[PDB]
Amino acid sequence: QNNVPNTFTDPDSGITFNTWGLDEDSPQTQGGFTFGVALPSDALTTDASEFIGYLKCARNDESGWCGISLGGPMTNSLLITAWPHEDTVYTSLRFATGYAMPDVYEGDAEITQVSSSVNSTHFSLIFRCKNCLQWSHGGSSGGASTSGGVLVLGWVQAFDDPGNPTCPEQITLQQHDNGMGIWGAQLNTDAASPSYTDWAAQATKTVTGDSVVGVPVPTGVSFDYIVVGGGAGGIPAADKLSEAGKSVLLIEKGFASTANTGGTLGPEWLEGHDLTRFDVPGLCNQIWVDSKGIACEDTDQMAGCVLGGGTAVNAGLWFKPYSLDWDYLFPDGWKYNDVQPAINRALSRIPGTDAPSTDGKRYYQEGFEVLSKGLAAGGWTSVTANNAPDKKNRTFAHAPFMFAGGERNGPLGTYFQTAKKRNNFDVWLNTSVKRVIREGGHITGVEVEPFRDGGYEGIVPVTKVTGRVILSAGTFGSAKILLRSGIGPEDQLEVVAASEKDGPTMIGNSSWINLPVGYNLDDHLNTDTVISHPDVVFYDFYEAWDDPIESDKNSYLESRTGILAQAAPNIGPMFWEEIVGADGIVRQLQWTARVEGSLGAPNGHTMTMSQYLGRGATSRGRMTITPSLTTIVSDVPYLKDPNDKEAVIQGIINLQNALQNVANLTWLFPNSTITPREYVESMVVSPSNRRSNHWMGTNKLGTDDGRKGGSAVVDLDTRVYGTDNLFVIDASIFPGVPTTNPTSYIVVAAEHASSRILALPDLEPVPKYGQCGGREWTGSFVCADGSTCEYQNEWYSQCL
Ligand SMILES: Cc1cc2nc3c(=O)[nH]c(=O)nc-3n(C[C@H](O)[C@H](O)[C@H](O)COP(=O)(O)OP(=O)(O)OC[C@H]3O[C@@H](n4cnc5c(N)ncnc54)[C@H](O)[C@@H]3O)c2cc1C
Ligand code: HEM
Ligand SMILES: *[C@@H]1O[C@H](CO)[C@@H](O)[C@H](O)[C@H]1NC(C)=O
Ligand SMILES: *[C@@H]1O[C@H](CO)[C@@H](O)[C@H](O)[C@H]1NC(C)=O
Ligand SMILES: *[C@@H]1O[C@H](CO)[C@@H](O)[C@H](O)[C@H]1NC(C)=O
Ligand SMILES: *[C@@H]1O[C@H](CO)[C@@H](O)[C@H](O)[C@H]1NC(C)=O
Ligand SMILES: *[C@H]1O[C@H](CO)[C@@H](O)[C@H](O)[C@@H]1O
Ligand SMILES: *[C@H]1O[C@H](CO)[C@@H](O)[C@H](O)[C@@H]1O
Ligand SMILES: *[C@H]1O[C@H](CO)[C@@H](O)[C@H](O)[C@@H]1O
Ligand SMILES: *[C@H]1O[C@H](CO)[C@@H](O)[C@H](O)[C@@H]1O
Ligand SMILES: *[C@H]1O[C@H](CO)[C@@H](O)[C@H](O)[C@@H]1O
Paired sense of beta strands 78-85 and 94-95, if any: antiparallel
| 442 in active site | no
Q: Which strands form 431-439's sheet, in the order they lie side by side?
A: 431-439, 442-450, 458-461
Q: Which of 175, 200, 225 is the last residue of a domain?
A: 200
C-alpha triplet 505, 509, 515: angle, nearest 5°: 105
CA distance 713 to 289: 36
d(CA 180, CA 72): 11
Spatial CB neighbours of 273, under 8 Å, sequence gap ≥ 6: 557
Which residue, 150, 169, 200, sits at the end of a domain?
200
Identify whether 36 is part of a domain: yes
Instruction: Give the C-alpha separation, 337 to 755, whole Å.
Output: 15
Is 351 inside any structural domain?
Answer: no
The Cα 106–Cα 138 span in angstroms is: 7
Buried/exposed code over 151-172 (b: 16+ C-beta within 10 A; e: otherwise) = bbbbbbbbbebbeebeebeebe
Give residue 449 CA to ligand 3 midpoint distance, Å.
14
Q: Is the residue at 160 inside a domain?
A: yes
Q: How far is CA 126 from CA 52, 387, 583, in A?
A: 8, 61, 52
Distance of alpha carbon 66 from alpha carbon 43, whole angstroms: 26
Phi and psi dihedrals of 626, rounded to 5? -90, 160
Please give the distance, rounded to the nearest whole angstrom, from the Cα atom of residue 180 to the centre of ligand 2: 8
Give the distance (Å) from ligand 8 centre to CA of residue 39.
Answer: 13
Which strand (E) or helix (H) includes residue 406?
Answer: none
Judge residue 564's burial from the number of C-beta atoms within 10 Å of its C-beta, 0-12 exposed, 13-18 middle, 19 or more buried.
buried
Count H helices and E strands in the chain, helices first. 16, 35
Residue 192 assigned ligand-binding role: no
Q: How many CB atoms lie within 10 A of CB 190?
A: 17
409: phi then psi, degrees, rounded to nearest 5: -110, -75
| Spatial separation of the C-alpha atoms in residues 49 and 53, rounded to whole Å | 13
In total, how many domains does the chain have? 2
Indicate whether 119 belongs to any domain.
yes
- Whether 619 and 524 have beta carbons less than 8 Å apart is answered as no
Residue 797 pairs in a beta bridge with 773, 791
The answer to whether residue 177 is domain-embedded is yes
- Note down the domain range covering 108: 7-200
Q: How far apart are the C-alpha atoms of 681 and 459, rounded to whole Å?
A: 51
Contacts of 497 (CB under 8 A, 6+ apart): 503, 506
Contact 267, 277 (CB under 8 A): yes
Distances (CA, A) of 417 to 64, 260, 273, 340, 770: 45, 8, 19, 24, 45
Quickly list H helices, 405-549. Answer: 415-420, 475-484, 490-497, 543-546
C-alpha dist (Å) from residue 373 to 379, 384, 401, 660: 10, 15, 22, 12
> Which atom in ligand 3 lies closest to the alpha carbon of residue 264?
7
Is residue 686 helix, strand or coil? coil
Residues in contact with 253: Cβ distance below 8 Å, sequence separation at least 6, in sequence order: 229, 305, 430, 431, 432, 433, 451
3-class secondary-structure state, position 594: strand
Residue 549 lies in a domain: no
Residue 122 domain-assigned? Answer: yes
CA-based angle 734:735:741, to the nearest 5? 50
Backbone angles phi, psi at 269, to 5 degrees: -85, 0
Q: What residues line ligand 8, using a CB cutoff of 6 Å? A: 197-198
- Alpha-carbon distances, residue 424 vs 75, 133, 252, 420, 458 (angstroms): 41, 56, 17, 9, 21
My answer on whether omega of the bond before 569 falls inside 30° of 0, hence cis, is yes
Strand partners for 667: 531
Please indicate, yes or no, if residue 168 is contained in any of the structural domains. yes
Strand 622-625, strand 606-613: pairing: unpaired
CATH number at residue 39: 2.60.40.1210
Helix or strand holding residue 426 (H, E): strand 425-428
Instruction: Out of 155, 182, 200, pick the residue that ends a domain.
Output: 200
Please pick, among 398, 524, 694, 752, the residue that the annotation labels catalytic: 694
Q: Tell me how many degrees the CA angle 393-396-397 measures, rounded to the nearest 5.
A: 140
CA-nearest residue, atom 14 of ligand 4: 512
Closest ligand to Cα 750: 1
**Distances, alpha carbon 221 to alpha carbons 11, 459, 765, in Å:** 74, 10, 22
